[PDB]
């Protein structure tokens, strides 16, 4: 019985920490979701310069390349 | 009352667990791809400025 | 109760391990470039023509 009271009280502070933790995590995921939208643009441009480098390399190798 | 609170804790745990794991897996894989994209991007621009230095 | 707790918590930690593991495989190369660009960071600009 007294042990149970102690356990219930510790469980109460536990549950409060649980809810606070998860609320912060909700904010975390929400933040990342909003961020995500501001990343696809950059990703596209990254792949654009990537394939640019790839294709220009292939063509330079085709012509008189001037590498090492 | 006692087990009602036990399962209240469990339901909160599992609920937010599913949420957190969704967050975790999806955004982690996404950001890993984003990271490698930014890697190649910055490296290309770095070499661009390197060649500019040699142009000087 | 405890069964759901241990199973779910174990899965949670497993997915966290997966998260960090893939992040190791996909981000571990950054410090090299970070050190590089830290060495490159010496910037100062005064437009003489302006």
């Amino acid at each position: 019985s007294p042990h149970e009271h102690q356990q219930n009280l510790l469980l109460s502070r536990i549950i409060t920490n649980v809810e606070k933790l998860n609320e912060a995590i909700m904010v975390m995921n929400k933040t990342l979701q909003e961020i995500n939208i501001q990343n696809m643009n950059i990703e596209l441009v990254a792949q654009m310069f990537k394939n640019y480098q790839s294709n220009v390399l292939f063509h330079l190798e085709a012509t008189d390349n001037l590498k090492d | 009352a006692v087990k009602a609170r036990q399962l209240a804790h469990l339901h909160s745990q599992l609920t937010q667990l599913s949420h957190n794991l969704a967050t975790t897996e999806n955004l982690m894989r996404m950001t890993a791809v984003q990271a490698e994209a930014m890697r190649g991007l910055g490296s290309w621009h770095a070499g661009l400025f390197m060649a500019a230095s040699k142009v000087l | 109760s405890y069964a759901d707790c241990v199973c779910s918590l174990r899965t949670s930690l497993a997915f966290l391990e997966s998260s960090v593991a893939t992040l190791d495989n996909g981000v571990q190369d950054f410090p090299r470039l970070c050190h590089v660009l830290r060495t490159v960071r010496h910037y100062e600009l005064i437009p003489q023509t302006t």
Binding site: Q53, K67 | G40, W44, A46, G47, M50, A51 | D29, V36
Partner: peptide, 18 residues
């Protein structure tokens, strides 16, 4: 562009020094 490619390959090289 040529030297930029060379520099990029050097940048992504796991080994590099100042």
């Amino acid at each position: 562009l040529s030297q930029t490619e060379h520099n990029q390959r050097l940048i992504l090289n796991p080994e590099w020094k100042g």
